[PDB]
A paper describes a structure:
TPADO forms an α3β3-heterohexamer, in which three catalytic α-subunits form a trimeric head-to-tail assembly atop a triad of noncatalytic β-subunits. Residues H210, H215, and D356 coordinate the ferrous ion in the active site, which is 12.2 Å away from the [2Fe-2S] cluster of a neighboring α-subunit and connected via the amino acid side chains H210, D207, and H105.
Additionally, a potential salt bridge between R390 and this carboxylate is observed, but the distance varies among the α-subunits between 2.9 and 4.6 Å. This apparent flexibility in the R390 side chain is reflected in its high B factors and could have functional significance. After crystal soaking with substrates TPA or 2-OH-TPA, the formerly disordered helix residues are ordered but partially unfolded, thereby allowing H215 to coordinate the ferrous ion. The helix stabilized by crystal contacts in the apo structure remained in its orientation upon substrate binding and did not unfold to coordinate the iron. Here, we observed an unexpectedly large change in the conformation of a helix containing two Fe-ligating histidine residues in response to substrate binding, consistent with the role of the substrate in permitting binding and reductive activation of O2.
Author numbering:
A (entry chain A), D (entry chain C), G (entry chain B): 1 to 154
B (entry chain H): 1 to 129
C (entry chain D): 3 to 222, 227 to 246, 270 to 411
E (entry chain F): 4 to 221, 227 to 247, 269 to 413
F (entry chain E): 3 to 253, 269 to 426
Write the structure that this text describes.
């Protein structure tokens, strides 16, 4: 039985991982055959499938973090995730769908703090071998606008 | 959780189900008895893609969202998993909505077959209420 | 001693002042965006039915673009002829006619004033004078051209046809990618912390492609080239992991060409990177900010498996692109690196002082081309 | 006893309703004879009674959403509520008095995200048919400033 | 020039007037610090000796204060030393004002009464012998009061408040403010538009019916009054919902006037809509932003039942008003619609080229009036 | 209609326009920050090893400062000589050479262009023309001076030496504090809602400082008689404000340890604030040592960068004294807190008064050293130095209007 | 064991105390021999000890609030704390080490709302007389930049 307490604890550990630059641990929050996407309300309302990030495997998440470390040029910055309470939309004895509101601050190494993104995580959760895991996370951003670029996943 | 008969009577009375839309407490206890056998985890897969969930066997096409029922209307606006807990709150709040839908307790087939116009107040005797 | 003083007839030197002078930016609105250019508005497939409209910009100027019952597309300035309010407030919709919310003036889909609330007064009194004539008031209409589904608009009666403006070589290079019906698969906007020109130069910058982007070098000099139209304004640049499927593709172009970037002055990009297709629209917003609007494309005839390849390869592009992420930041690196250097000049000497086509990509010929077209529009020659 | 978890769950469903533009459902969070008001710390400290929104019935709330749908002209935008944990001042199995911190982001259809309001909800809760219901919600805004207009209630 | 007027008449307004920054600085010199009366606050907000508020006249910060003579004084909130704000609070009560930077003291008139270390410290430093306090001070304002309204001017030449308003505006103010009023709430709207677009909107009798849609979605005669200068107007009107009590009201005016909106150049509004009374103060902030400060009002003599009626009817007005909500946004729709059209002209021809009073409200006479008064103050008038 | 018109030769009157005129701000970048001044960059101990660099600003202009293998420190404009990109994107690091990310042009630690990607073209096509010569392209280099570990840079080769620029008295006052190795114990930035000049005037404002100090002795927290003074160099640009006890004269807080301190200077000086035109501050307040760097950001905003200091030889108990006394300084300082806000009070108070003048008459019209602190001599000094660099002394027509006469001598 | 719910309840009472300007009660959240510091990620990453605020006793916190009331000049403003869910790194029945994400809005009396600080509290909790108390709170700010000044502690 997945409940709001397990998902809140999970969401806090996910936020801590992404905000601390322990990005190597981010893929472990997902199943092998997961989906992750960053999109916006317009795309989601029209049923448009593309994401500024789009992954249908945990390996694609690991590649995205490799590229972030070793390949991509971006000005140093950090995220601060402030999350709402998860609300479970659907569930049975073993699976659950949930929505979690988020806000992400971007803090540049030079000190500027901006509201960088906000929206909801539309999630499909499962429990394998005692581990709560995302089968799916769609970060539906409220805004169609990304300021400058997006290096770190939401 | 397997409830005791009287344990469940007290719990249903505390969530205001004595005489809720004409139905005395015994009707609700009798209903849970023949729907779920007082089992909060009871589940019954139907051949139409829907499942009945919990102590009062609430259906995943009309009432709760289980995420695998085509045409889900979710009129209680809850996930079906909320109807599989130890705490009967979500099942009571959903039941109050169902019993108000216009067909009273006839929504519950087992209640209709085994409880309706019996001595339903036998299901709450020997209890502290 | 002006910070926009050009130092010669050729474009091997660009005054850094051109990226911060506000008077010069207003001249760009008069002489480029409302001058003899074609502004990219949207795809015809985004307004398929009668009444379908989108709102957008030509430079700073808000635009309505709309399909009529004749299946033609019209465009006009999103400015009420009464007191100047935006007419259409929605990014998109479907309508019989446009109504300004302020005093209920009505416009048809051509942008003609069809109705003025209380034109003839109320009871005895008020309304317009006898001399007031609706037909003499209206927003500026745009000339519309459609080329392979691309909807362009101009303020200018004198701008050549879209075919002549693009020239044959750009026409054929657009046709090559937009040869069959396309489908929008996603929209995203990037807000760039730079003057628009720094991004348009970046798109034309064949020199940077392999050097800024370690994805372009690490997992890919190859056969390729740079094409510049006669005006200099338009270019083509062309070229031929635990989950390798990021870069797994399928053949779908007749030539061997795995990369084609195409620019149309002053802010249109069509990209083909393997199976990743997209359109970009570049808009000026303020002296040091611009907007890049991405329209991701599939072909209507894609299978599930082809469409999935484009959704995976889209990781290369856009705001989080393994390639294009850097393109969102490099303009700002320039905007900031020149903060004390308004009086100095960019050095653009790679491949000579040429603004023509070249069989290599270790050249800045397409960047010089941009400044040739810019100076002609802006009256800054020699 | 009504506790901080039940109030937070209530607050999250209220926020989800207002942030999804399911505005028709907003009045069902209140009793028939409810009070709802949007005010600011200056008015609240001086004891000034007026609100940008002022309602002493659920019917007034319903009419405000009718007017928003049929009558009011405003540029398309959405809210993103980020709520704090409630503090309960008093209450029992049926009633509670509680204060909940809030922040509201506004996101225009054109992409701009701003902090539009912040403050606390001063609430009186009752229980109808076993469900929490607002007898009273006073949205005390930290700022005396509303950017442009206020179309959606807080 | 994007601020070139196209004629003597005001049927055409150059859109450049809403974006030219040089012209905005001229507005601060020739309007806000020129021959106008700037609305500061209500007498009931500063009832007792020492009570003060801070506010603005255009860009210029102001202190307004009640002294022991029961008179009201106003001065520029600028220390005469090195220019710091003197009063840092929105409101309070004080004997005297003190700049925090180097402790210069000012009386309630704005006179410099004390300079820290004026005579030096242990007989070293301080001011030279030639320094005289009485020769240094913020600019003082002329104050005028009218039925509880407090106005300030920088100009020695501004007419009396009665002559500036003229008779008809004087009578229409007195009709509402005939007895003591009480603030029942304050709210500010930050408007994404040049100030003038909001002030035009207040005067826009044409839009009031068409923009709003509230009474028409869910007969009586009206008119527009314009003072002799053009700067001031009155727009008036005289004889579905699950909770009709929103619009349930009571008689409290001698006439049958159910709506009266009144403007005083360059930024004062007095509104009466049924039993909903308020004042607005419009301030310029930047070329494309302004501030609208609402003061919602009851009468000090209201019963609980009358006051409740005003608290319900307040839903019509303010930032979320069933009527006024749109007023906060239409300015910005203009500001943005004209982004490419700085060289073009607004068309204001409804009700002719008149700047005088009219029966009916399908006219822009009070909008043309605003531009007549504006061009006079700004030195932009052309001859017929 | 000029809002930057000086009233006369004297600095007792400052045109408020000087704090809002944007044309004049650009002139400050050409004539001050890239003129004959020394810009504070960092401490040598912050780039101790070969390859260690920091990025910073001289005015609006981004700078790289770097240690080389010769143990010398170099500085250059952080601007690629190709198309103008920032070269170094990190606040600090260690590198062999600097490479621009845009087209891979390489620079050594002096700022010389050492490499141009595809300079010679590919397969005999493109690259640079024959005429292109790397040694003719490069960011502007700075002249570097290190004085008691303080690294300064100038864009001008004609700037006086750091010793002549400071003068003897300021040199000794820096040495007094930076007499032995220092250690950075923290960094904090304040974004000030004011023109840079209002903050630099505030550093030099012995009037405000002595008023505020006299308030803090209301609390009776020391109780020992003090004398103060102000030192101004010959140019006006640099000051020291101090307070001292006379060693060997005779005769509230729940944790008094905030103000418990220890003798560590061979003098009675309890407070010394020292300014170096146009944006350097060195402070000693009891045992609280710090450096400040002031940078212009926009016409009405500036940045103050604090570097807090201990001495490398501090014991645990001496370092703890400095960590407690740091509560007096910085963004939340018992003493400095209001320093962040008074500039903005002026910026706003003058909103309608661009055509009016500040009055700076305390201590007369002199720009020299003084006994006591009830003076604005160090503020007038700043304006003397400012007008010299800016070419705003009485020139030509107005000098002629005053002097076109013949008095009886 | 001290748990995430007790720490979240404590953090809400701490935030309410600071956001209501009941600053006299702020020192009571700490042990007599506590440590409190306001610092930033750069200082924390390099191991630099100095704080904008630095206290090694409850008495030092009380003096800082005295000085705020009776000595400091600053323009009137308030805070709005929005907190995330805490993570416990280690602890037993009486001690715990924990991290809590935070955002602080500053609202000026004149109406401007800004993100003033964000980061995490690095906390050491003890239990005195059955009640949670901070032995240590380090407010590690994401930004090196403080707008204007910092009067109220984080
Ligand atoms: O904007 C882009 O994606 C891009 C621009 C230029 C080139 C090139 O000329 O090789 C490649 C990619
Ligand atoms: O701005 C306003 O609230 C307002 C302005 C005019 C009218 C009118 O002419 O009826 C009503 C209200
Ligand atoms: O900017 C400062 O912190 C400061 C400036 C001057 C003095 C002084 O003159 O005593 C003290 C402190
Ligand atoms: S501005 Fe459009 S109808 Fe008046
Ligand atoms: S600025 Fe007011 S006393 Fe100095
Ligand atoms: S801008 Fe630096 S190499 Fe091109
Ligand atoms: Fe690129
Ligand atoms: Fe209106």
């Amino acid at each position: 039985m997945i409940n709001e307490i397990q998902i809140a604890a999970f969401n806090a550990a996910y936020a801590k991982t992404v905000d601390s630059d322990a990005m190597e641990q981010w893929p472990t929050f997902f199943t092998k055959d997961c989906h992750y996407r960053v999109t916006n309300v317009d795309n989601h309302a029209e049923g448009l499938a593309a994401g500024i990030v789009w992954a249908d495997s945990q390996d694609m998440l690991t590649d995205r973090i490799s590229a972030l470390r070793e390949a991509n040029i971006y000005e140093r910055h950090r995220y601060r995730h402030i999350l709402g309470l998860p609300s479970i939309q659907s569930g049975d004895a073993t699976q659950a769908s949930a929505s979690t509101p988020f806000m992400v601050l971007r803090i540049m190494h030079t000190g500027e703090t901006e509201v960088f993104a906000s929206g909801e995580y539309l999630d499909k959760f499962t429990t394998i071998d005692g581990k709560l895991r995302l089968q799916e996370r769609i970060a539906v951003c409220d805004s169609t606008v990304t300021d400058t670029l997006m290096a770190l996943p939401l | 959780k397997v409830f005791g008969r009287c344990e469940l009577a007290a719990a249903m009375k505390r969530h205001g189900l004595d005489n809720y839309r004409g139905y005395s407490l015994g009707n609700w206890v009798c209903a849970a008895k023949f729907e779920s056998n007082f089992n909060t985890q009871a589940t019954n897969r139907n051949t139409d893609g829907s499942t009945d969930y919990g102590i009062l066997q609430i259906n995943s096409r009309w009432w709760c969202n289980d995420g695998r029922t085509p045409g889900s209307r979710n009129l209680c606006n809850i996930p079906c998993s909320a109807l599989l807990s130890s705490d009967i709150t979500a099942s009571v709040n959903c039941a109050k909505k169902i019993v108000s839908d216009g067909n009273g307790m006839n929504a519950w087939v087992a209640w209709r077959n085994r409880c309706k116009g019996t001595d339903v107040q036998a299901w709450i005797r020997g209890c502290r209420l | 001693e002006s910070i926009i003083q050009w130092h010669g007839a050729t474009n091997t030197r660009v005054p850094f002042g051109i990226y911060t002078d506000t008077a010069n930016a207003d001249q760009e609105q008069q002489r480029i965006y409302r001058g003899e250019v074609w502004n990219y508005l949207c795809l015809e497939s985004e307004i398929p039915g009668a009444g379908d409209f989108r709102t957008t910009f030509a430079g700073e100027t808000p635009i309505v673009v709309v399909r009529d019952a004749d299946q033609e597309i019209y465009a006009f300035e999103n400015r009420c002829a009464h007191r100047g309010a935006l007419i259409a407030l929605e990014k998109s919709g479907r309508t019989d006619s446009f109504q300004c919310v302020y005093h209920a003036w009505s416009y048809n889909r051509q942008g003609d004033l069809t109705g003025v609330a209380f034109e003839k007064g109320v009871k005895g009194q008020g309304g317009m004078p006898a001399s007031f004539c609706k037909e003499e008031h209206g927003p500026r209409k745009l000339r519309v051209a459609v080329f392979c589904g691309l909807v362009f608009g101009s303020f200018s009666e004198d701008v050549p046809s879209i075919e002549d403006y693009l020239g044959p070589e750009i026409c054929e290079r657009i046709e090559r990618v937009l040869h069959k019906p396309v489908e929008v698969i996603g929209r995203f906007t990037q807000k760039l912390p730079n003057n628009w020109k720094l991004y348009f130069e970046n798109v034309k910058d064949s020199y940077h492609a392999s050097l800024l982007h370690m994805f372009f070098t690490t997992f890919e000099s190859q056969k390729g080239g740079v094409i510049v139209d006669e005006s200099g304004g338009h270019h083509v640049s062309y070229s031929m992991l635990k989950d390798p499927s990021l870069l797994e593709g399928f053949e779908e172009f007749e030539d061997g060409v795995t990369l084609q970037i195409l620019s149309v002055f002053p802010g249109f990009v069509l990209q083909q990177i393997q199976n990743s297709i997209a359109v970009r629209q570049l808009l000026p917003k303020s002296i040091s900010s611009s907007e890049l609007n991405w329209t991701y494309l599939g072909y209507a005839d894609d299978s599930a498996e082809q469409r999935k390849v484009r959704l995976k390869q889209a990781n290369l592009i856009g705001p989080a692109g393994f390639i294009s992420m850097e393109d969102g930041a490099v303009g700002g690196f320039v905007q900031r690196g020149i903060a004390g250097a308004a009086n100095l000049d960019a050095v653009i000497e790679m491949g000579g002082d040429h603004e023509g086509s070249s069989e290599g990509r270790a050249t800045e010929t397409s960047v010089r081309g941009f400044w040739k077209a810019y100076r002609k529009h802006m009256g800054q020659e020699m």
